[PDB]
Design a protein around this ligand. Structure first.
Ligand code: BOG
Ligand code: BOG
Ligand code: BOG
Ligand code: BOG
Ligand code: BOG
Ligand code: BOG
Ligand code: BOG
Ligand code: BOG
Ligand code: BOG
Ligand code: BOG
Ligand code: BOG
Ligand code: BOG
Ligand code: BOG
Ligand code: BOG
Ligand code: BOG
Ligand code: CL
Ligand code: CL
Ligand code: CL
Ligand code: CL
Ligand code: CL
Ligand code: CL
Ligand code: NA
Lengths: 304, 304, 304
């Protein structure tokens, strides 16, 4: 029996793809990592293909559900997961076929830029977006899609292009988070949306990963500044975790994967640069354990 | 028959002065640019003189209109156009008389600092500024006046002073834009004010132009970050343009000139630094075509 | 007759400790400064000890007042003064006993991190913090505690750790000030709270002092950017001062000490780096005169 695939589900391959790329950067330090990087990679791409097929199905037979998602001042943001993961799969495929990889990366970059130009600017005409629309998911089209373009174009050798996209993501981040934290302080989020709190972890770590990708792994003052703020939000989120899962654990916690994987990626670069190697090992293992718990609970839900 | 000159009209020489200075930086790459730079320069200064005279007239015979502008939590910002363009005319005059140029630049810097100290701080006593007061024009006294002081003082050799003013402008920018974008998302702007959306283009490009002026044209990571965010807002604004001019074209679109000219200026520096030369040429030509359309429509309105 | 010590009173040794450390950095330029640095230092530590004892008393016999402070979405922030000054006293003691100094600095760092993880994140569950809770004092646990950890750990040789804490403070600063200034524009502050406006001066100068502490006194572009924004807020505050003390002078003005002392500290580094030496001397003297007026009025209040 057919069914419209919920767009949020792209968060699953996203996380897994990100984790692949983290292990991929351990290769020259520990060659066995390459094996791990391949397995995650293949799995992430399999799911991605399947999900793309399902979403194409949803575009033909449930198109009005997609349109309603697209016009919502909140739900549209999850549409951005599609180009994002498309770019990440591109990065994975680069290790085997740089030509398919570049095609995918350009599809994802052009698509996310076009999505945000169409929709996020249109938010500025007012009267649709409301105060209660201020959701962490807004980071996906505004910030994460940009950081992913930046690292992917860097992967292809377009470093200055990557810098333009990186600046767009970083300043969009700093421009949106103030009002998001203020809204969280005043109204916060209903249990149905609380799992979305995990995206709050993402901006600093995704930022630093894209920055280190474009600047050839140079762990400078900026990268440490970013890492400090990221660990601050990590601690806040750890303290908040009981409240976030107050109504029970659920697949929505895949929202943390993006931050967790990015932490692991950044950890790798901090480890090559010989900066805070102990914190790096801790971060790398902790994000891997957390994404492993997520995969275990997702298999338990699927097989039951 | 006398008439009080609307303060917004200083936007016209402002734009033209900025465009002059952009072409001025092409001189060592294409000497013919110097000719263009002179013509724009002279025209910008002519208008400036005329406008200053009119505004002096308005200060003597319509003073209460100026006072009402000054006390408004929205309209006061356009007063800042006067020192800003005063500084820009100073920069133009530097090519011929550095002494008049320095006098003008100090007048403009002291005047804008004194204006903002008097008025913007007073906003913090509450009860006059309202949520509906959150207008893009607030960037003029808070951000642009500062960036203009920074580049002008740099022009005079006061680089560290210029850096103080640059930091004031950049952090004021980052501190105000979050709530401005949130307000645009929720309420946006009535057609009477929509042309003011063009000032949203300005901060990143004016920032980067002032930064490159103070740092001797060094196109570094910061300048590329700024350029990326500026092009993001440019694209948003292009998408929004039909809505902005929904009630018809009008002289208010001169609000875009400041961003457009600044883009052209930054383009010049990016071209000397051999960074994204294709994007630079595109930006330079596009801003020149847009300001040319503005001059053509302003002549059509004046001669009809 | 016993009495619960008001937590805000830690602002007094804080300021004095900060001023000590400012003079301490003049030593190699003017050895007499070391004498001044010692006197302030000893006084700051005496008060600190006394205040700690009183607060321990308040914890045993007035515990419910402390708990009510802790649960308030506004008043909790002053609790952060305790670790902050604890760290500052640690820094002073370093000149004589590095072992006690390190113990104090770790107590203060662990304590402030734990305080903010417990309480500031909990703000994000909503419904307690209100729009009217947006107070400048929020900078203490969010921003200043972090900058103080950063400089203290640097003092101990943990420069990369210090950078993590510095980034947390700087991005927390930039993330909170937008909504604070917007709230000040719209509602501002009742006379009972107006003295708290002095904390608005603090972020940029405390930031730059921590940054120069961690980066070995290198006065670079960032430090000048910060100094420019700090002087902008200084001027705004000077203009606002009559309104701030509209209902009369009071001990609450010690809220300015933290910014003033930090200005003096930054001035020292700017003077060693040979950057804006005239502005540096002015800043150093002006903050010293202002904290001296504060000490004089506090003695007049105590002896009367
Ligand atoms: C579904 C994702 C694409 C599948 C392509 C798998 C290619 C198998 O790649 C394997 O790993 C090594 C290094 O990665 C390669 O050198 C070899 O091709 C093979 O050992
Ligand atoms: C990934 C989502 C892309 C599709 C987003 C849907 C946006 C289209 O929007 C809709 O398109 C219709 C076409 O008939 C028009 O009739 C409607 O006016 C318009 O609202
Ligand atoms: C949120 C904004 C943070 C920007 C961080 C900018 C830090 C770049 O600062 C650099 O650090 C080096 C220290 O090793 C110095 O040698 C360089 O002169 C300095 O430019
Ligand atoms: C990304 C989220 C971090 C992992 C969530 C761990 C759950 C934290 O809270 C849980 O309850 C108690 C602590 O509160 C402890 O008994 C458990 O260790 C922990 O599982
Ligand atoms: C990345 C975070 C999701 C992976 C699983 C984290 C573990 C959550 O485990 C937590 O343990 C508690 C008992 O200690 C339970 O009461 C909570 O419901 C449960 O969330
Ligand atoms: C109204 C603005 C001031 C007018 C001064 C015009 C000076 C004419 O300047 C012209 O351009 C050359 C380079 O710019 C100069 O070397 C020469 O003076 C002349 O060729
Ligand atoms: C460029 C605009 C500068 C002028 C701004 C007007 C600010 C003066 O403000 C007005 O000045 C009057 C002087 O009689 C006083 O009576 C009023 O109290 C005061 O509101
Ligand atoms: C919004 C804040 C962005 C600040 C950008 C800071 C970037 C300065 O970063 C500099 O980039 C160079 C790469 O060429 C490195 O060699 C330097 O070590 C590094 O300090
Ligand atoms: C700074 C503003 C950018 C220039 C405004 C160009 C007007 C964009 O929209 C106009 O309508 C249609 C596109 O929507 C096209 O037919 C036209 O090319 C264009 O003139
Ligand atoms: C800098 C932007 C102002 C200069 C003029 C931009 C051109 C705007 O041209 C646009 O073309 C459309 C038809 O294509 C018309 O419907 C719009 O009313 C008109 O704004
Ligand atoms: C209450 C704070 C601790 C008191 C310790 C005071 C130690 C007195 O220190 C004095 O200053 C000199 C440099 O500072 C030291 O070399 C000498 O110990 C002494 O001259
Ligand atoms: C420096 C301030 C530290 C103390 C903050 C008080 C936070 C404790 O909080 C209180 O503790 C009580 C313990 O009996 C509990 O019964 C209450 O549920 C709880 O609100
Ligand atoms: C608010 C964010 C401001 C960040 C300031 C970053 C400035 C670092 O910029 C540095 O300045 C030097 C100029 O001496 C250049 O030589 C370096 O290449 C450049 O990286
Ligand atoms: C940190 C606060 C700065 C010092 C406060 C100085 C008081 C400013 O205002 C006071 O009133 C008049 C100016 O308005 C003048 O007569 C006085 O010089 C000044 O004392
Ligand atoms: C750091 C700021 C506090 C130290 C004292 C600053 C001096 C404030 O002096 C001011 O002078 C005015 C008269 O000129 C009085 O009317 C004000 O009440 C008084 O605040
Ligand atoms: Cl579930
Ligand atoms: Cl470590
Ligand atoms: Cl018109
Ligand atoms: Cl190019
Ligand atoms: Cl008092
Ligand atoms: Cl100086
Ligand atoms: Na707000």
């Amino acid at each position: 029996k057919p069914f419209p695939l919920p767009t949020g589900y792209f968060g699953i391959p996203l996380g897994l793809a990100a984790l692949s790329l983290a292990w991929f950067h351990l290769e020259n330090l520990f060659p066995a990592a390459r094996m791990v990087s391949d397995v995650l990679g293949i799995v992430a791409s399999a799911v991605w293909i399947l999900f793309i097929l399902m979403y194409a199905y949803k575009l033909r037979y449930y198109f009005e559900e997609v349109r309603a998602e697209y016009h919502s001042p909140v739900r549209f943001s999850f549409i951005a997961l599609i180009p994002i993961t498309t770019m990440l799969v591109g990065d994975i495929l680069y290790r085997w076929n740089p030509l398919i990889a570049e095609v995918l990366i350009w599809i994802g970059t052009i698509g996310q830029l076009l999505f945000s130009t169409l929709r996020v600017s249109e938010l500025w005409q007012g009267g649709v977006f409301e105060q209660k629309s201020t959701h962490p998911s807004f980071y996906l089209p505004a910030v994460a899609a940009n950081f992913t373009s930046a690292s992917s174009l860097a992967l292809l050798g377009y470093h200055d292009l990557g810098y333009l996209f990186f600046g767009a993501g970083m300043i969009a981040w700093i421009i949106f988070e103030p009002v998001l934290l203020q809204h969280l302080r005043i109204s916060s989020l209903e249990p149905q949306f609380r799992a979305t709190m995990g995206i709050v972890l993402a901006p600093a770590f995704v930022c630093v990963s894209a920055y280190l990708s474009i600047n050839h792994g140079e762990v400078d003052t900026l990268a440490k500044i970013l890492w400090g703020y990221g660990f601050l939000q990590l601690f806040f989120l750890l303290r908040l975790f009981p409240w976030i899962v107050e109504k029970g654990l659920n697949i929505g916690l895949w929202a943390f994967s993006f931050g967790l994987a990015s932490m692991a990626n950044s950890a790798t670069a901090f480890y090559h640069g010989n900066v805070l190697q102990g914190v790096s090992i801790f971060a790398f293992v902790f994000s891997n354990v957390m994404i492993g718990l997520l995969v275990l609970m997702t298999i338990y839900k699927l097989t039951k």
